[PDB]
Paper text:
L-asparaginases catalyze the hydrolysis of L-Asn to L-Asp. The genome of E. coli encodes three L-asparaginases, called type I, II, and isoaspartyl aminopeptidase/L-asparaginase, respectively. The active site pockets of these enzymes are shaped by two protomers, one of which forms most of the active site scaffold, including all catalytic residues; it will be referred to as a “major” protomer, with the second protomer called “minor”. Yet, as we demonstrated here based on the reinterpreted structures of EcAI and the new structures of EcAII, under some conditions a citrate ion can be accommodated into the active site cavity and even displace the canonical substrate or product.
Three structures included in this report, referred to as EcAIID90T/K162T-L-Asn50, EcAIID90T/K162T-L-Asn56, and EcAIID90T/K162T-L-Asn62, were determined for crystals of the EcAIID90T,K162T variant grown in the presence of 10 mM L-Asn at pH 5, 5.6 and 6.2, respectively. We found that the structures are practically invariant within the pH range explored in this study, both in terms of the overall fold as well as details within the active site region. Therefore, we will describe only the structure of EcAIID90T/K162T-L-Asn50. Somewhat unexpectedly, we found that in all three structures one of two independent active sites (in protomer B) was occupied by a citrate anion, despite the fact that L-Asn was present in the crystallization buffer, which is illustrated in Fig. S2c. The position of the citrate in these structures differs significantly from those observed for EcAIIwt-apo7 or for complexes of EcAI. In this case the ligand is stabilized by interactions with the affinity His6-tag, contributed by a symmetry-related protomer, therefore the observed binding mode is an experimental artifact. While the active site appears unoccupied in protomer A, there is a blob of the mFo-DFc electron density adjacent to the side chain of Ser58. Since we cannot unambiguously interpret this electron density, for the purpose of refinement we modeled it as an acetate anion.
Numbering used by the authors:
A (entry chain A), B (entry chain A): -1 to 15, 31 to 326
C (entry chain B), D (entry chain B): 0 to 15, 31 to 326
């Protein structure tokens, strides 16, 4: 019979070819779906922020019943953060698919048009429901939790570096062989429909001879939470460790992640988490650990509980 | 005729099996070289710092004539930083080889013994001279500039993620097919033999809704230089960009690197470097960009000159 | 009350006979009651159909007598045996394969810790119902996707298209994935009455390829030929012509690829419908052989072989 | 004064005949004076010895008439042609190969930007003396190590053992590496008088492997056989016995590996000295064929073939 209705929510510039005119930039979209577009905000992905996240999640939650699936156009710099936020806060189990482009739309061999096409194909496929928020880039379907950018410029940068992709797309057909095991979307307790702001969580970097001043500035300003981008398996330079130990004793939530791009920051391996009240991020990298910590702090300030959240989501 | 003399400088705990007794932990070392060991410092790699670096570089430079090659035992967390520092400051063109272990020496299938063996094999091979400071891990020879840790726990974590390894080791023989093109060791102008400290350079992280407070703390404390771990191709969150723009106008050196684990942060692509007085790090990740910036600042505070250094070393 | 784990050996020892293992790796005692048995003693590179049938029958038979199985197997052909077992084992208890890239007498031998992690894996209840597993280098990999990516590296084993199922740290496994394709007790393949498998060989494509290998297999009456194609399963002209003719005579022909990752997709490069060819999807040539052998025990029709290739 | 770059085409067009290219990619005009010529018109999967000899002769002949060459070639066998040219081209001007993973009429076709970057590469003086290059997905790769890693991905081309030579950003190349093995004008191989190459075929190893492919090649008088071995170049028993016998009769036998990265090392698994076998090092089977063909134009002694395999 008929084609699904897919809504395209844009957050920034056009990635192909005016969100209302996408069907004229990529006319092949008409054969896959009845497409409607809305510009929700217009900003550079590098300036992505908590208000945009709250706005997007509310919009998807409210409009879930009116459409068969969503495609979100988003810049590549912070795609991985936005995707995990929505993966935790969207209560709609219809396909929510994010997509961007590594090359500008006017450039030779621009990747955006085919990325957009494939994203609409993903959002229109019934098998894509109930898998969480998805990122479609370079002929691959990736889950919002594991997905990250691995290269500054490559069209193939987006990968799920720990657990792999969910599926591959070839000629408008998707071979799914995986689905994420951690809880997402409608299975999480996080509800943002009444929040107009989120807890303050910052990130500090570790390295040889690291200054403690970044950590001290965040504590002095009353941050709710601090993520450490540790060295190796979440290790801290001594002055950073002293400042964070004190902070965690006096009510700051402290998550140990790693600057190292793959693998888990594991619980009491290098550092005695139970003694200091620290939380280990597992496979969440620093920027994703921030997202989960922010949301955890809307429900609890207890480190043992926060740790359990980091083991479930 | 006879075996080379190799000196093993240790910075921390034993990686096999007491630096003087390594020849009893790995007796096969005797067949490859006449080995001597010295404990230079004893610290956790996560607490690595500028004084240790200055001490190591002086020691290698002074002792260069007394030995055929050096092996340095070092923890894995900051190996990649220490290696690049020495790659720029060591004036000895005999093999300088760093080595560590991802598993403790008492654990089942400890990687250290064979890593140590292979490191001594590398340091004893005449073909290893004139290639810069080398890291030997998991049967692979890696140059100190490109080498980084890719996984929190894997024995195979060390990779040269942009340009690849220099050689592979199989049965005590190395097949070298590459050598680094950027200038190293005795071809650089950096000389640390008279320095008892280095310029202050810190790192700030970018992410959605990033605080500018870490950057402001470093500027207020008079840091000489700031490396930004940007999003994508070295992009900055707006408040971080405003603070750094001001800082660079008033004499702080500012290098744009990326949190993204591979690829170059390229010069005037995303950001107008010439307008703001910023320097693009190319393929140096944030912690390595710090090392080069520190050394650049012992010779110049001019951004155009600093950029040229970042294009040569 | 520790689980009972059976170790079935197929070759030499990977740590330190088969009942010496608890002496070689004393930490095993703390995690399982281990019993060992030497099923065959063969080098992995000489792995064959008989060993496969034997292993599947032993596991299917002893399923109710133990809580899980660890099979010690050499690394060269581990990926083939693992997938065969993945399709033919009807025990849904953990079945975990393990080997070693370095010999047991070498410095920093990988076998002991690998063996220890394999037993940890087979003893964990969360490992059941995931199909046949390979445990190497602290990683838990599914039998369909796992392949060896490097000739000598201890980290060689990877699931190159869809990734691992779990990682192991201090004896605990973080499972975040399970394979979607049907395995073990969900397959129709039953080897309990078979003493032999259909004959399936493999030919390689490259520039200026001889069609002689393909002709030698056709002339010998092979039931099936898998092509290790160039790119997206393409064939050198002369090999193509030999295989189009054999397909018309009822030889089953599967297009796979010499290229180490990605699917050989259906009807994209070659018109499979027209020549009666089957596309392997993500199965590399040696894995596509395994499935084709089994498919041929149920059917010789290409369209139904294609569907099997789309479900298992 | 822009460089003169010649585009030699071997098949269809990768952007948009061969002189239409400057209309298809107008930005080329700003970086080079481009002349095009269609040397053959063949699908990459049917690539053969004749096309190789022709391309090497054309480049060797026209070397002094142009500043660099771009060769448009289909992706399936690009890695083979690139290495053949790398050993036989005596022009030390840039020779750059390029192709496309998506067809020119598809959405987000990769050929135009690839072609543009290839011409950029051939026009840059820093590209000379690095041997024959492949330029794909903003990356500059050497002809010996480059291989295709995925069946469909635009990013498929990688130098999987030693990495790329350079990356291209906004028309500038950051070169940080050059290949150490001898190439182009440093090799002894000269194809200028040859109308044919020695016959070298490829056999695959796997569990329960037939020795029929190997026998079909021996019986036909092949000069050389490359084995795509399991693990570190191992051979299934029956294939081993067939090839040990052929080696004794003077067939040249090279052990390579089906495993996609790492070296097939000398005397490690198999005693090469004793059977007269040669180990391929990092050359995969299809690349090892190329070098073996050329080695056989100078010598039939295994020890000297081994040395060639250790130098080129």
């Amino acid at each position: 019979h008929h084609l699904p209705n897919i809504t395209i929510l844009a957050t920034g510039g056009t990635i192909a070819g005016g969100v209302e005119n996408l069907v004229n930039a990529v006319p092949q979209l008409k054969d896959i779906a009845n497409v409607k577009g809305e510009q929700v905000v217009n900003i550079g992905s590098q300036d992505m922020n908590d208000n945009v996240w709250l706005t997007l999640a509310k919009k998807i939650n409210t409009d879930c019943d009116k459409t068969d699936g969503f495609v979100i156009t988003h810049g590549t710099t912070t795609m991985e953060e936005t995707a995990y936020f929505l993966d935790l806060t969207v209560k709609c189990d219809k396909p929510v698919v994010m997509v961007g482009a590594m090359r500008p739309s006017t450039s030779m061999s621009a990747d955006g048009p085919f990325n957009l096409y494939n994203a609409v194909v993903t959002a229109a496929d019934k098998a894509s429901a109930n898998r969480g928020v998805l990122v479609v880039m370079n002929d691959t379907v990736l889950d919002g939790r594991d997905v990250t950018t691995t290269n500054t410029t490559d069209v193939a940068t987006f990968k799920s570096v720990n657990y792999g992709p969910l599926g591959y797309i070839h000629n408008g057909k998707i071979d799914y062989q995986r689905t994420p095991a951690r809880k997402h979307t409608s299975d999480t307790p996080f509800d943002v429909s009444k929040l107009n702001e989120l807890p303050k969580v910052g990130i500090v970097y570790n390295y040889a001879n690291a200054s403690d001043l970044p950590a001290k500035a965040l504590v002095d300003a009353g941050y709710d939470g601090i993520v450490s981008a540790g060295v190796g398996n979440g290790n801290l330079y001594k002055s950073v460790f002293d400042t964070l130990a004190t902070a965690a004793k006096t009510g700051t939530a402290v998550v140990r992640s790693s600057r190292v791009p793959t693998g888990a920051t594991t619980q009491d391996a290098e550092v005695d988490d139970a003694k200091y009240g620290f939380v280990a991020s597992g496979t969440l990298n620093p920027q994703k650990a921030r997202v989960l910590l922010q949301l955890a702090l809307t429900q609890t300030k207890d480190p043992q509980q926060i740790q359990q959240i980091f083991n479930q989501y």
